[PDB]
Design a protein around this nucleic acid. Sequence first.
DNA 1: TCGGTAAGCAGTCCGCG
DNA 2: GCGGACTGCTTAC
Length: 901
Amino acid sequence: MKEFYLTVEQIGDSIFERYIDSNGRERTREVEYKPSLFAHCPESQATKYFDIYGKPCTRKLFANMRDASQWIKRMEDIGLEALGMDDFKLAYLSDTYNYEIKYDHTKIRVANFDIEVTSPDGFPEPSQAKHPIDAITHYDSIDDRFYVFDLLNSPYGNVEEWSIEIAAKLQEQGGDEVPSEIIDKIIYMPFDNEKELLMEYLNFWQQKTPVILTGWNVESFAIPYVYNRIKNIFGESTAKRLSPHRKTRVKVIENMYGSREIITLFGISVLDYIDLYKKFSFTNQPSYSLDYISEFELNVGKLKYDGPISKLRESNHQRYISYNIIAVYRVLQIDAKRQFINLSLDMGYYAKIQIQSVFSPIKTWDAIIFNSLKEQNKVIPQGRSHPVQPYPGAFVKEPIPNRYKYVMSFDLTSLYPSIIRQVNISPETIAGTFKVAPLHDYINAVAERPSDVYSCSPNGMMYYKDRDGVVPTEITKVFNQRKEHKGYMLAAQRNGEIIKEALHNPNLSVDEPLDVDYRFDFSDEIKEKIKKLSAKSLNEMLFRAQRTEVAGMTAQINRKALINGLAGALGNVWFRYYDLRNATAITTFGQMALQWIERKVNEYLNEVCGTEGEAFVLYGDTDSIYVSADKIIDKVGESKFRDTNHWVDFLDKFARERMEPAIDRGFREMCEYMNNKQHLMFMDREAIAGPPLGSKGIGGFWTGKKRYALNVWDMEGTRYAEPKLKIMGLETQKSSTPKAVQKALKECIRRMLQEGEESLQEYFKEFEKEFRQLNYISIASVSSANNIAKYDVGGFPGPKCPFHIRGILTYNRAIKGNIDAPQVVEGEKVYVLPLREGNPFGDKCIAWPSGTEITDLIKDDVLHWMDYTVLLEKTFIKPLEGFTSAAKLDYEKKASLFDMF
DNA sequence: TCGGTAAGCAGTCCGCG
DNA sequence: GCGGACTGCTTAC
Ligand SMILES: Nc1ccn([C@H]2C[C@H](O)[C@@H](COP(=O)(O)OP(=O)(O)OP(=O)(O)O)O2)c(=O)n1
Ligand SMILES: [Ca+2]
Ligand SMILES: [Ca+2]
Ligand SMILES: [Ca+2]
Ligand SMILES: [Ca+2]
């Protein structure tokens, strides 16, 4: 097989590399890598190396990496550019793996671990590590085994061995319900003392050294705790055995309001799953506890135990250990679904970076562009310092707040990357500038044509047309990968709908789910077999189709995020290719494109309808337009349609056969106007929305920019078994909105769009009547909580204290002196409830850590004093009033003359 | 929360005769 | 009470 790296590090003048050799074996080597950098040289001097602007360079080969770094410093002292890859390990990888990396995940040791630490005096601080580590569960992907290290004797209690037999039993038999599929994969090791546990753990680590190390909060808790605990018991040299090169560094992670420490383990790639999830999931969750995320992702119940976690080991060591094992498995289950590790490996190896660098789009693109340029013996520029400067972004149309009955949306494919490719925007393709007119003048095609030679953006920039820039070349590659995965995602989505349809008529039989590839549209034969399947088999197929769709979503959305990240990196001062001329060339072209096509779409539809000056485009945001289709439907007449699916088909055909060609003609003209390199503005129909045929539903409404709701029948070619609400921006979509209130507001919206005003009024009256019975957690608001200290003046709110921070201060006073009470963690999320006048907490609200029950010490009092009236007004009535006033509807029945009978 | 801009709403403070 | 200046937070792209 072709070799591939696992990890790479620079330690002084050596590169330390772990890799898989040509026989599939893991190896380690230390290489005295001699880096090269570059200086500009005279034109009359033969070289094969040129900078990106075509200026010749001489290569400087250094005796060692320290010499190279010192040279960079002296070049700064002199005032001359030091060119080339200054991150020497990326240069090493580029020299050592000068081909597209083919990696084999089965050879990569991926470790998932979790530790338990009993602590009587609150949260066990990793930098102190003053409490024994009393359990470690460490799953190894190569062995496919859960290694359980269990401390039986501690100063906080002596316990009996954990029983795998009890662990396997149902909770109803007094068991822990450790899933049967992992029972035979557990290797259980009890220890008489913590010193022996840790020594054995280190020997095990040495034998089975993680390449990728993950788990939940491992980077912020488990790793620093284990490192510091071993350091405290045994000394530094022993703790450094967690690094295969025996090198570690305390790394200070700074943010706006403070800092924290992590431990860098040289020769390991730490991908904390909480951070993978935050980056790649595209969710914003009210809590990031593993129990909360597990329930969200997997629909598994919370891990149930009695009493505080600080007393769990002593009271129920059996459950304590079982829950540590289950916690490790939950992360593997989330990964089996989401496939974030797979994604990270794919992107890291593609870019030729340390796998952990996938967190940095700047590092990722720097490496991609570097490797690309190096292929042509081109030399990258030195990074420079720049002041942070604001720059303009997208255009968003102000909508007229209203109901909108029939709506068709259109959207540009991968807009910013398409602009980069169309215009040819790159550091080395800048050709010059032209005299800019107001943007309105380009939108309306009255400005002078910018150039007859170069490709232009309405910000004034011109670009070469003779050859593709490196940024367009490399962005196109990732764009093409993204397109492939999005195809698989949409097919799985369409396949899911076929199964949902068939589930209306399940057959009474015993059978099996069909063996199919859900990434490809089902054939006629498959469709025929599906129509004969039982509900059991159909539901199993639906689950599998949906898992396929999720895997496709992960692969496609994050490749989209990467290419959009390159457009944004051009506006980040730390990017080697930072240039506000290029960043603004993209965003300004985007503003023009949207408003240009708004004009063209209005012109086309006014022509087909035989009107002038009427506004068909009701809204647009960045790259999408929303078109009122009422007049199109009305030209046919609602009476002429058999059912909802009939007018949806008609609009689908109208959009594909009439509107899309008009839109294409409009953009081809714009391409010629800007003299662009290649026409790539591809705007396709996105959604078809409207009320069910014959109903009183309103179809859709807008309240303002980035705030609307539509009843969608077809989305990007997926014809839904049942209409789907597309709600953007409204409170139903906000993590700050209470869970039960999101649900209620969504149903109000469903009723508005699908059934009408009377149905909405019926539901509102019931909710208002019953909501006080809702569980307190389900009606609590949620907020991130920053700067608790800033607003804390003797335990009371300082000037301008935010509402949620006020709540935290109330909580802090209520739990004062109690060492065991859960503390609110700066920067994390809290639940917030309003409190009625004259409550014993002395303030108008209280807040406590999100994802948790409020402590038993004050729970009773919180429940008794919760202000349900304020809660309802603020989270439910106020947003609903906004929806209904926009839609010109009443949520309560107005008096009429009939009341007189 | 270590890792592009536009723009919405909640809440504080305080004016507005 | 409602709006502007401002902070804080959270979305849509
Ligand atoms: N984090 C983000 C999200 C979006 N955008 C910009 C660039 C996108 O091209 C544009 C429109 O975003 P969309 O969500 O409509 O997605 P794209 O058009 O990029 O992709 P798709 O092909 O899915 O429509 O907004 C951005 O700069 N950064
Ligand atoms: Ca735990
Ligand atoms: Ca788009
Ligand atoms: Ca059937
Ligand atoms: Ca869009």
